[PDB]
Amino acid sequence: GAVATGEYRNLFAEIGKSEIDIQRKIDEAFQHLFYGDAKDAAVYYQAGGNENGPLAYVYDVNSNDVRSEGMSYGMMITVQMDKKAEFDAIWNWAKTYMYQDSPTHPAFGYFAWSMRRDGVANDDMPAPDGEEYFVTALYFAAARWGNGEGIFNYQQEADTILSRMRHRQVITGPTNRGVMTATNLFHPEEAQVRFTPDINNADHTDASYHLPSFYEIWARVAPQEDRAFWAKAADVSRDYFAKAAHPVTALTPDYGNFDGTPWAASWRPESVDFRYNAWRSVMNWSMDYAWWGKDSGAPARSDKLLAFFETQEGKMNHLYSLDGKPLGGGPTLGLISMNATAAMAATDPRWHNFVEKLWQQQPPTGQYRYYDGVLYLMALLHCAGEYKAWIP
Numbered sequence: 001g002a003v004a005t006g007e008y009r010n011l012f013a014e015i016g017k018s019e020i021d022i023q024r025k026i027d028e029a030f031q032h033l034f035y036g037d038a039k040d041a042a043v044y045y046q047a048g049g050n051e052n053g054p055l056a057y058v059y060d061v062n063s064n065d066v067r068s069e070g071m072s073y074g075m076m077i078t079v080q081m082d083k084k085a086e087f088d089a090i091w092n093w094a095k096t097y098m099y100q101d102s103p104t105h106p107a108f109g110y111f112a113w114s115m116r117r118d119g120v121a122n123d124d125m126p127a128p129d130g131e132e133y134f135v136t137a138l139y140f141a142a143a144r145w146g147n148g149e150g151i152f153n154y155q156q157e158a159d160t161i162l163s164r165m166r167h168r169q170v171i172t173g174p175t176n177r178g179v180m181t182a183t184n185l186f187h188p189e190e191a192q193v194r195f196t197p198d199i200n201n202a203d204h205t206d207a208s209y210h211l212p213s214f215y216e217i218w219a220r221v222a223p224q225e226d227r228a229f230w231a232k233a234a235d236v237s238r239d240y241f242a243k244a245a246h247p248v249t250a251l252t253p254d255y256g257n258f259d260g261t262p263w264a265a266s267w268r269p270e271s272v273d274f275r276y277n278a279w280r281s282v283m284n285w286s287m288d289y290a291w292w293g294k295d296s297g298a299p300a301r302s303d304k305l306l307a308f309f310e311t312q313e314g315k316m317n318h319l320y321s322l323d324g325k326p327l328g329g330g331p332t333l334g335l336i337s338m339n340a341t342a343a344m345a346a347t348d349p350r351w352h353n354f355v356e357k358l359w360q361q362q363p364p365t366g367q368y369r370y371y372d373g374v375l376y377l378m379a380l381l382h383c384a385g386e387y388k389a390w391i392p
């Protein structure tokens with residue numbers, strides 16, 4: 001794997017792009033999404049400052065609300081791109097406004113998944129892949145830049161947040177939504193990330209939240225007493241993808257049960273299909289295979305997923321049944337982007353076409369550019385050999 005050798009595949013170079021052009025492409029993506037026109041192009045906003053210096057956020061320009069996912073992806077993008085100033089400003093906002101620091105609040109130790117631009121939470125509860133990316137980006141920051149103090153002691157922040165994700169106790173108390181009860185963020189016996197710590201829907205998962213590539217990082221650098229647990233989670237996730245992905249198409253559902261079966265959320269029964277969450281599953285397993293070389297099923301799974309999307313050429317939807325029936329929409333940049341990241345594991349040379357397809361895109365504009373854009377920029381970095389394990 002790339003971590004052992006230090007050699008990350010440059011998939012764009014493999015399909016014949018020059019390094020000058022690859023650098024232009026990444027830089028254009030970043031400049032547009034971070035510093036482009038505020039109404040049509042940018043998803044990053046500078047929001048004054050406080051005692052820790054500048055504040056900024058990545059946000060869903062559609063809803064006009066901040067998402068913990070977007071903040072955490074912002075941090076990952078910026079650390080990968082060596083953009084410390086933007087990283088610190090995003091982190092300052094997440095830690096200042098999103099992080100729940102009251103030990104009697106049921107979201108204690110978690111980041112509000114949905115928050116308004118003035119810091120008013122829409123929902124105090126987390127979207128746990130936010131936490132997963134926050135912790136990992138923080139470890140990467142420590143590696144690349146060294147640790148600061150206070151909230152910029154990135155390694156100490158990561159250790160605390162991660163320990164609490166495993167060891168959080170059950171807490172019942174007041175929130176913006178009424179009295180709620182929440183637990184830990186990983187199931188202690190299953191060693192799987194939860195879809196939610198809310199006790200009413202806690203015993204479920206989401207394939208797109210499984211990040212064995214990052215669990216391996218935590219297995220190396222987390223507090224000692226948790227390293228075996230994280231190592232176990234990495235094995236468990238590799239098995240999870242093998243069970244959860246359809247055996248013909250490799251499509252996964254948005255939401256899932258611990259045993260690998262789809263889960264229909266009461267408020268969103270269509271979660272059993274391949275939708276906006278599940279786009280990312282192939283990135284997660286392909287990244288894991290590229291870095292660590294342990295998911296022996298990842299190459300065949302990525303081959304199957306690309307073989308399926310090849311049958312959709314010219315009639316591309318972005319919502320599918322797991323067996324491959326189109327359920328609506330047209331092509332999206334976010335799905336193009338994630339499908340290109342399959343090439344981190346794929347063996348069949350059709351992967352060149354999917355990488356080429358990502359290469360041909362422009363940065364997103366208009367109302368849906370946040371989710372399309374953060375997926376786009378992450379996929380550009382993976383495909384350029386610029387998204388690396390920075391181990392402290």
Ligand SMILES: O[C@@H]1[C@@H](O)[C@H](O[C@@H]2CO[C@@H](O[C@@H]3CO[C@@H](O[C@@H]4CO[C@@H](O[C@@H]5CO[C@@H](O)[C@H](O)[C@H]5O)[C@H](O)[C@H]4O)[C@H](O)[C@H]3O)[C@H](O)[C@H]2O)OC[C@H]1O
Pocket residue numbers: 060062067069113123125126127196276277318329330332333334368369370371372
């Ligand atoms: O129930 C709560 C959970 O929902 C919560 O999870 C978080 C929110 O949901 C997930 O992230 C969101 C995924 O959906 C995105 O919305 C759209 C989806 O469509 C994308 O593509 C468009 C499709 O249509 C085309 O016409 C158009 O051109 C395309 O761009 C669009 O780009 C997206 O913006 C949201 O933006 C994401 O935030 C994820 O699980 C969590 O972030 O967790 C708590 C739980 O209580």
